[PDB]
């Protein structure tokens, strides 16, 4: 039995989801039940109770709140999703609220998945998850990822 964590939704159904901070054993069980085997954690302090769920692998990429992921972090995130999805495993990504840091990562993955530029990728994540991508530097990070990988 799982309990859906806060602000959870699929971006790529069965492949890639965003969420706010998970914090109960049943949140992690929910992720496992939905086929998630990897949780990319962007917070400065690990989410509560993750150690109750050994079957879920956490990948901690620390990003200060209201700041963008760095290029190495974007590349690592993209690798984690590509490799997990190729193994038939889904990935979740979270921050404290699930909007800024999380939305920026999700938009970068769409740049790659759909061959989009940042305007389209950011628009799409905002359509799916209104409130996503909170700062100017977060927007610029998606743009620069596009430029590096075009």
UniProtKB/Swiss-Prot annotation:
<dbReference type="GO" id="GO:0016311">
    <property type="term" value="P:dephosphorylation"/>
</dbReference>
<feature type="domain" description="Tyrosine-protein phosphatase">
    <location>
        <begin position="7"/>
        <end position="150"/>
    </location>
</feature>
<dbReference type="GO" id="GO:0016791">
    <property type="term" value="F:phosphatase activity"/>
</dbReference>
<protein>
    <recommendedName>
        <fullName>Dual specificity protein phosphatase 23</fullName>
        <ecNumber>3.1.3.16</ecNumber>
        <ecNumber>3.1.3.48</ecNumber>
    </recommendedName>
</protein>
<keyword id="KW-0539">Nucleus</keyword>
<dbReference type="InterPro" id="IPR057023">
    <property type="entry name" value="PTP-SAK"/>
</dbReference>
<dbReference type="GO" id="GO:0060271">
    <property type="term" value="P:cilium assembly"/>
</dbReference>
<dbReference type="InterPro" id="IPR016130">
    <property type="entry name" value="Tyr_Pase_AS"/>
</dbReference>
<dbReference type="Pfam" id="PF22784">
    <property type="entry name" value="PTP-SAK"/>
</dbReference>
<dbReference type="InterPro" id="IPR020422">
    <property type="entry name" value="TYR_PHOSPHATASE_DUAL_dom"/>
</dbReference>
<dbReference type="GO" id="GO:0005654">
    <property type="term" value="C:nucleoplasm"/>
</dbReference>
<keyword id="KW-0378">Hydrolase</keyword>
<dbReference type="GO" id="GO:0004722">
    <property type="term" value="F:protein serine/threonine phosphatase activity"/>
</dbReference>
<dbReference type="GO" id="GO:0005829">
    <property type="term" value="C:cytosol"/>
</dbReference>
<comment type="function">
    <text>Protein phosphatase that mediates dephosphorylation of proteins phosphorylated on Tyr and Ser/Thr residues. In vitro, it can dephosphorylate p44-ERK1 (MAPK3) but not p54 SAPK-beta (MAPK10) in vitro. Able to enhance activation of JNK and p38 (MAPK14).</text>
</comment>
<comment type="similarity">
    <text>Belongs to the protein-tyrosine phosphatase family. Non-receptor class dual specificity subfamily.</text>
</comment>
<dbReference type="GO" id="GO:0004725">
    <property type="term" value="F:protein tyrosine phosphatase activity"/>
</dbReference>
<dbReference type="InterPro" id="IPR050561">
    <property type="entry name" value="PTP"/>
</dbReference>
<dbReference type="InterPro" id="IPR029021">
    <property type="entry name" value="Prot-tyrosine_phosphatase-like"/>
</dbReference>
<keyword id="KW-0904">Protein phosphatase</keyword>
<dbReference type="GO" id="GO:0005737">
    <property type="term" value="C:cytoplasm"/>
</dbReference>
<dbReference type="InterPro" id="IPR003595">
    <property type="entry name" value="Tyr_Pase_cat"/>
</dbReference>
<keyword id="KW-0963">Cytoplasm</keyword>
<dbReference type="InterPro" id="IPR000387">
    <property type="entry name" value="Tyr_Pase_dom"/>
</dbReference>
<dbReference type="GO" id="GO:0008138">
    <property type="term" value="F:protein tyrosine/serine/threonine phosphatase activity"/>
</dbReference>
<feature type="active site" description="Phosphocysteine intermediate">
    <location>
        <position position="95"/>
    </location>
</feature>
């Amino acid at each position: 039995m799982g309990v859906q964590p806060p602000n959870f939704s699929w971006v790529l159904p069965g492949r890639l989801a965003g969420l706010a901070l998970p914090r109960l054993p049943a949140h992690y069980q929910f992720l496992l039940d939905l086929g998630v085997r990897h949780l990319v954690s962007l917070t400065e302090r690990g989410p509560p109770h993750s150690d109750s769920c050994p079957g879920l692998t956490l990948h901690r990429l620390r990003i200060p709140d209201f700041c963008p992921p760095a290029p190495d972090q974007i590349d690592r995130f993209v690798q984690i999703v590509d490799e997990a999805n190729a193994r038939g495993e889904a990935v979740g990504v979270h921050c404290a609220l699930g909007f800024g840091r999380t939305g920026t990562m999700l938009a970068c993955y769409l740049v790659k998945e759909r061959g989009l530029a940042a305007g389209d990728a950011i628009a799409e994540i905002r359509r799916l998850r209104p409130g996503s991508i909170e700062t100017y530097e977060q927007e610029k990070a998606v743009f620069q990822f596009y430029q590096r990988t075009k």
